[PDB]
Design a protein around this nucleic acid. Structure first.
Lengths: 286, 286
DNA sequence: AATGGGGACTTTCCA
DNA sequence: TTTGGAAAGTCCCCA
């Protein structure tokens, strides 16, 4: 029931299999103690990873353990630089938690037979420990630098009347925990449309640099003063937009009744801070 | 009989004055215990700081104490996050040193009357200490973050006849110790020229920020799919170049027979990769 | 080697 | 609050 976490195991034994139904997104920013927990690991499908034990037949709920293991060139072992974090049951957290030790923190949720021996891991975050605080403590040789990829490790301990314990362990896909690269400045050099009717609706191509899938295009309007009086996002064709070409659908101007052209601006923004200098566009009366 | 480093001494007593004859540069990048030594503190001229004791008539060399202290606020005390560092008495280093402790290293060098009691400090470097190593001590110290300004601190103890030793202390100007961003992203806020004839030759003034003498300007043109079809460096009037104003000679266009306006771009570049936001310029026919 | 200069990586703070 | 989004601190490399 407390088998060493460094001891190797298998995901399947006889008719018993421990499987990860829903995997986690390949990216999760681990949080530090000096900052507010950054939530629980999520699934690529905007949900949560799912784990399930199949061949179980008894009616007594087992205990699923969760911990963070390595993801390097060596066989999986618990990660010394990250620790699972009990994403304190808020509103999304449904699966009851429970923390244990063993020099490695490990959670433990239950695998109820009524829940077909499958659980929704929505109560497990990833805390990042400080290298300096770890390295060379309790006998070490491992180093944290560049060791920022991990795996969610799961395991169950099935008891058999024959006095036998079946221990299954399943590791998730590698997860990247370091903060992702920051947004560069999107730059707009050319544009294939300078104006169109108030209805908007046409496609515009922005020739530039540093465009991405997260690139956004905002259309605004200034008063002679500087008071921005209009903001409208323009739909980007992610299916066509490239790093140096951004396809954008010109929005419908805020007022179709104008009888005189009206100058406006629009910028490309990466993330929520990296915008390009305002650009020019004109809307014509119908 | 040995004075504490956090005592309120002064640079002058009566006929006695401890003086910083040559202040150190206002900047010096400190080295970490993990990097090899980054060198001795220097004077804005390439030479080194100089300290002198003035009204001393005896003929017994004294010992000038050297240590690193706080720069800004309150009373001067040793800096918990910085330490003086003895530069190996190499052929170049002309002054003899000797180091000791008191939770904060102190370097001592000879102050000899054969030299008018004036020492050239060319044997002192600055060691940065990890913020977490310091802030962790039970002692209620300060905060390392953004606390990168230090000050060279010299001390002398003059033994008199009565058996009373006079103690003098002098602090240098503040020294910034953080690494020097060496190049910042140039920014063009304004321009006094939008048009020009394909012959170019005219002068364009760019108001902005982060402009340096090294700054460059390039004119470019490209297809809507990014192919560059024209690239020309405009000549900057190095001389009249301010840090937020560049004088550029608009270059001649590739085709001098245009009968219609040709839209192009140009940008400012600092270094090999920190270029500005692309700018819009038009070229006129005739 | 010592040298710095520059830049990638880690940790902390902030809009 | 959230938490992306830097900003400051520490460690590594040698066009």
């Amino acid at each position: 029931s407390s088998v060493p976490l460094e001891w190797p195991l298998s995901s399947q034994s006889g008719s018993y299999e421990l499987r990860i139904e829903v995997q986690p997104k390949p990216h999760h920013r681990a949080h530090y103690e000096t900052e507010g927990s950054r939530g629980a690991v999520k699934a690529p499908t905007g949900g949560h990873p799912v784990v399930q034990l199949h061949g179980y037949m008894e009616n007594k709920p087992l205990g699923l353990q969760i911990f963070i293991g390595t993801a390097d060139e060596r066989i999986l072992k618990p990660h010394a630089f990250y620790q699972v974090h009990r994403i304190t049951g808020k509103t999304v957290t449904t699966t009851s938690y429970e923390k244990i030790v063993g020099n490695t923190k490990v959670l433990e949720i239950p695998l109820e037979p009524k829940n077909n021996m499958r659980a929704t891991i929505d109560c497990a975050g990833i805390l990042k420990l400080r290298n300096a605080d770890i390295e060379l403590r309790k006998g070490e040789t491992d180093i944290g630098r560049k060791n920022t990829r991990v795996r969610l490790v799961f395991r169950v301990h099935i008891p058999e009347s024959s006095g036998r314990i079946v221990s299954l362990q399943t590791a998730s896909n590698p997860i990247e925990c370091s903060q992702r690269s920051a947004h560069e400045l999107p730059m707009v050099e050319r544009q294939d449309t300078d104006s169109c009717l108030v209805y908007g609706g046409q496609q515009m191509i922005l020739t530039g640099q540093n465009f991405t899938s997260e690139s956004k295009v905002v259309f605004t309007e200034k008063t002679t003063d500087g008071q921005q009086i209009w903001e409208m996002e323009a739909t980007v064709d992610k299916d066509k937009s490239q790093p140096n070409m951004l396809f954008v659908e010109i929005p419908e101007y805020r007022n179709k009744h104008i009888r005189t052209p009206v100058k406006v601006n629009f910028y490309v923004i990466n993330g929520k801070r990296k915008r390009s200098q305002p650009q020019h566009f004109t809307y014509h009366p119908v």
